[PDB]
Write a protein that binds this ligand. Sequence first.
Ligand code: X3Y
Length: 346
Amino acid sequence: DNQFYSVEVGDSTFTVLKRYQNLKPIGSGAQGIVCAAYDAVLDRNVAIKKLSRPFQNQTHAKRAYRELVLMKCVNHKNIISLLNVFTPQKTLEEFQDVYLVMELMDANLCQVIQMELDHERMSYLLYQMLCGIKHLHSAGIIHRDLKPSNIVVKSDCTLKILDFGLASFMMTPYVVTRYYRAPEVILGMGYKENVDIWSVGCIMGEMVRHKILFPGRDYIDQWNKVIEQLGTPCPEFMKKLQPTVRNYVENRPKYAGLTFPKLFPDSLFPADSEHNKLKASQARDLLSKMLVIDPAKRISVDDALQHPYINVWYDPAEVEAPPPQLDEREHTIEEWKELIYKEVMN
Ligand SMILES: O=C(Nc1cnn(-c2csc(C(=O)NC3COC3)c2)c1)Nc1c(F)cccc1Cl
């Protein structure tokens, strides 16, 4: 007779609508735990995400509220869509957890990066990532924190981006992945649309090399990896850093930078035919236009899509889409709880 039922997925209690059956663990993100389930009404498999007390702190609250708001309006194949939103709690006072439902995907882009993919799959995943980013940009949303763990894929190579980016202190054991963040973000230096192009390049290079391009304990070790490989940036770029950050970066040892065939040799690409020899040079040309420290000289999202390696997948209804109280910040626990509760029940 009750509309919900309780099941223990590992060590996380999922209390869901009775339509959701056969829950199975499939991932453990920094925001919440996710399950696979069969939906009895839609007759299809779905993913369920639980947000445990999203209102418990500013970082948790601004992301939980912001994503619920942005999902209600963005409409694209390469951006996550919500099939459902629900809370087992009946009142604001008892309100604790929120559950988000989406189509069940088959794998995380982290899993896909470990595979030796051909040029056709590699170029189709990169194409979709750019279409998703271009739609977010079209809707006034520059991401700034795109990474493989918040990107999911189907067996038919279709791709969807799960989060919406940046808005500080998290008092937990799990630490955030900063390896795909642009130099503009690392150095706390103003941004524009192509900041996400850098993150696409970090993914593309890792797809080729099968290792994180810019590893590091903190942004100190990270900036070391960006200049050792790509070189110390030109004086034009140093002439737009903040004074304090400028003296750090200009004081760092200078590097000429390894050329893109040295960083990504012919060995790492399929080269068994003329078609593959050409596609290796086209992929290496794009990596060299995406992994550019200066955003003024880094490639556009529109130009990235029109590049020969990517423009083989172009279609009119898979690039642009008709665009449409723009978010809130700084609230108590109770004020954030109420704002999030409002979005959950319209
Ligand atoms: O991760 C999330 N979603 C997601 C969708 N597919 N997947 C997935 C990754 S691996 C995998 C798998 O193994 N599928 C097998 C093939 O049949 C089982 C499946 C993960 N978060 C999320 C959510 F769940 C709900 C709403 C918002 C968000 Cl953001």
